[PDB]
């Protein structure tokens, strides 16, 4: 995995010489201490170094009887790592460094839990893979390294009371979706969209801190695949801007996915990047929750585009079969777009002229539905009357199709 850092190093300088303080898991302990421990003039800014084919990212601090002047939390990476990973890891390093500096200023956390390991190194010299459980600090660093390798969400707790929440979008959105695409898609959301989560609501409220925003829990309680955000803002009694902010925050950490709600006539098909392996690891969970049905036998239904509710308590159970496999990215949603490229109807002409800034192929029919209230029959008849100016297209939505692993 390119995104996975090779190792995590903690080094520090001062009026005792450079001293490597931790390394998890081809360089000497003196070489690294000499090169990675910079001077005060380079403090407070990004630190990037490259040697042969190994890269080092860090952020010194200047740390302001003390015997320590500065430290550095460096992460090692492959030479060909993506620069966004470098920036994310530098941000994580700065987040660690600032809280460590605050702990130093308050209770001298650093140069009290730094000489014990210093002396313990001599005791094990009669050192960084046999002193780990002797003092919590290296344990936190090892946990961060493991989370980066596997989880992608680092929830660290230093001094048992300072929380540090960080996310690595590269290893999270792997329906390997670039973080830039998600960020771009997340600034173009509309009130007629819906929020949906894979996990159960009860299992979603246990991750949050002991002082969340009440709007956070309020959104989770009254979120469903049928309602949209506007019908959620009123019920939770929140402003639409706050609803958008909360939805973006939840989507960013991979705990929420934005889809169009489940109307009866939503038209779907299989995602192009689907994986019907007939022995896939995900097919071992579809049967583990739904025994009587075989996944390659149900996914075959959505070959041609079919309506959401046309027989795709059997119906009341089939809806769950379209939520678990839509929180999974197996299918997509099609949509009808129009672009411009009868005269004896001034009433229709006035409405058509009013809704003329949408016919660029970038606005969907249901956007017109929501913005200018006009029944499906009226809009469809309006489009059908013209047969020489407007072009009808049937394709996916490039804003929400990002989530189902489909870049534009």
């Amino acid at each position: 995995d390119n995104t996975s850092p090779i190792s995590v190093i903690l080094v520090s300088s001062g009026s005792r010489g450079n001293k490597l303080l931790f390394r998890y898991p081809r360089f000497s302990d003196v070489i690294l201490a000499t090169i990675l421990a910079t001077k005060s003039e380079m403090c407070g800014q990004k630190f990037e170094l490259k040697i042969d084919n190994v890269r080092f990212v860090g952020h010194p601090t200047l740390l302001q009887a003390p015997t320590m002047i500065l430290f550095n939390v460096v992460f090692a990476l492959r030479a060909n790592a993506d620069p966004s990973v470098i920036n994310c890891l530098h941000n994580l390093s700065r987040r660690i460094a600032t809280v460590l500096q605050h702990e130093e200023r308050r209770c001298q956390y650093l140069t009290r839990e730094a000489k014990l390991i210093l002396a313990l190194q001599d005791e094990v010299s009669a050192p960084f893979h046999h002193i780990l459980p002797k003092c919590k600090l290296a344990r936190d660093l090892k946990e961060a390294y493991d989370s980066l390798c596997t989880s992608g969400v680092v929830r660290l707790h230093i001094n048992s009371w300072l929380e540090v929440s960080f996310c690595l979008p590269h290893k999270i959105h792997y329906a390997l979706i670039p973080p830039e695409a998600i960020e771009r898609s997340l600034k173009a959301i509309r009130p007629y969209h819906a929020l949906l989560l894979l996990s159960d609501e009860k299992s979603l409220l246990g991750e949050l801190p002991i002082d969340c925003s009440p709007a956070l829990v309020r959104v989770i309680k009254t979120t469903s695949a049928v309602k949209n955000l506007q019908q959620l803002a009123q019920d939770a009694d929140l402003a639409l801007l706050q609803v958008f902010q909360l939805a973006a925050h939840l989507v960013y950490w991979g705990k929420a996915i934005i889809i169009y709600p489940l109307c009866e006539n939503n038209v779907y098909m299989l995602s192009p990047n689907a994986s019907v392996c007939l022995y896939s690891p995900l097919a071992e969970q579809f049967s583990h929750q739904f025994p009587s049905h075989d996944l390659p036998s149900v996914l075959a239904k959505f070959s041609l585009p079919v309506s959401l509710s046309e027989f795709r308590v059997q119906e009341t159970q089939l809806i769950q079969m379209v939520v678990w496999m839509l929180q999974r990215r197996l299918l997509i949603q099609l949509h009808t777009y129009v672009c411009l490229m009868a005269a004896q109807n001034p009433e229709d002409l006035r409405m058509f002229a009013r809704l003329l800034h949408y016919f660029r192929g970038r606005h969907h029919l249901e956007e017109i539905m929501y913005n200018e209230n006009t029944r499906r029959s009226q809009l469809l008849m309006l489009f059908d009357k013209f047969r020489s100016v407007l072009v009808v297209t049937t394709h996916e939505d490039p804003v929400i199709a990002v989530f189902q692993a489909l870049l534009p």
Binding site: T34, S271, S275, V276, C277, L278, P296, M341, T393
Partner: protein, 363 residues
């Protein structure tokens, strides 16, 4: 890839490390050098290793060199000649140049003691004064120094690693060919080049040219690496395509319009309009094959080649592909199954249409 300055420094026995020469002069200020001094003139363990350091919005590249022999002051000589660039320059192709330059300098010092005495030291300034312009403007420099050593430097850009070419892919030329010396090809590239047309899959090429399949795949991968050929899916009158959102960009980017109208245009016909092309790229359906469209848009297809139309749509991502998924492990396309089996898609049709044990899926 511009080079802001080239600087030469060495371990001065009296004043310690300091800069000795810069081109242009005084580009690297002392209060900047005395910080990267640790990574510039390094401990012996770091010798013969490229060092790239970012500081003060500048990017310093170097390779410290230590030559150990008794004749020198401290039984060793330390020197480094390095480059300066901007903090955001993509200098991944400037490392081999620095390494080879350090090799040249150490060979010169070992042979003619070029760097030891002060007589040949002053010759450095014109050398860098030539190097800067010869590399910035051209990226190539041939500079003679003495009767036995001549510096030859050529910069090569590092293009990305290529994908893998499967047996069923169809290669299509993108550089139009007829622009290279056939005598300068690998003599197996010359074997297969007359067989790449945009309609032949790798197995068919290997069958026609009597070349090993593993070798043909490697050759096509190399052509991908250089960017001379691309890969598209097989073309057949029973394929199904679903339009892509990027189709809209066809109407909102003049260069793409011109390229599409030029390529799709039938040879020997008036250039096709855009009104008959944006309709073809939106009238395709997951229930209409390339055969129904022969009679569905008869007037529209009067200046375009259907094969070229579909191909161009594929390369520019204006069109997606729909296949059939049933040895029927599931992860095999219909075309791959047919190619391994050796029967037609229609032949495979009367082999799963009436034999219900495993069903057909479109993805």
């Amino acid at each position: 890839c511009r080079i802001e300055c080239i600087f030469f420094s060495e371990f001065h026995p009296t004043l310690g490390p300091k800069i000795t020469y810069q081109v242009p002069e005084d580009f690297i200020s002392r209060e900047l050098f005395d910080t990267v001094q640790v990574y510039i003139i390094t401990k012996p363990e770091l010798q013969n290793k490229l060092i790239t350091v970012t500081a003060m919005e500048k990017k310093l590249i170097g390779c410290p060199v230590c030559i150990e022999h008794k004749k020198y002051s401290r039984n060793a000589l330390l020197f480094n000649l390095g480059f300066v660039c901007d903090a955001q320059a993509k200098t991944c192709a400037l490392e081999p140049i620095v390494k080879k330059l350090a090799g040249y300098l150490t060979t010169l010092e070992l042979e003619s003691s070029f760097v030891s005495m002060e007589e040949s030291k002053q010759k450095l300034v014109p050398i860098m004064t030539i190097l800067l312009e010869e590399l910035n403007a051209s990226g190539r420099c041939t500079l003679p120094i003495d009767e036995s050593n001549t510096i030859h430097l050529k910069v090569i850009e590092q293009r990305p690693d290529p994908p893998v070419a499967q047996e069923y892919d169809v290669p299509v030329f993108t550089k139009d060919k007829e622009d290279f010396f056939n005598s300068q090809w690998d003599l197996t590239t010359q074997q297969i080049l007359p067989y790449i047309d945009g309609f032949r899959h790798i197995q068919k090429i290997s069958a026609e040219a009597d070349v090993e399949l593993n070798l043909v795949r490697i050759a096509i991968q190399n052509l991908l690496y250089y960017g001379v050929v691309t890969l598209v899916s097989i073309l057949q009158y029973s394929n199904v395509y679903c339009p892509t959102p990027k189709v809209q960009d066809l109407v909102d980017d003049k260069s793409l319009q011109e390229a599409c109208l030029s390529y799709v245009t039938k040879q020997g016909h008036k250039r096709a309009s855009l009104r008959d092309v944006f309709q073809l790229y939106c009238s395709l359906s997951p229930g209409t094959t390339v055969r129904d469209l022969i009679g569905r848009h008869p007037q529209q297809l009067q200046h375009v080649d259907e094969r070229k139309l579909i191909q161009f749509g594929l390369m520019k991502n204006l069109i997606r592909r729909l296949q059939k998924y049933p040895l029927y492990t599931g992860c095999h396309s219909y075309d791959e199954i047919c190619c391994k089996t050796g029967m037609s898609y229609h032949e495979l049709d009367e082999r799963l249409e009436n034999d219900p044990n495993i069903i057909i899926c479109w993805k």
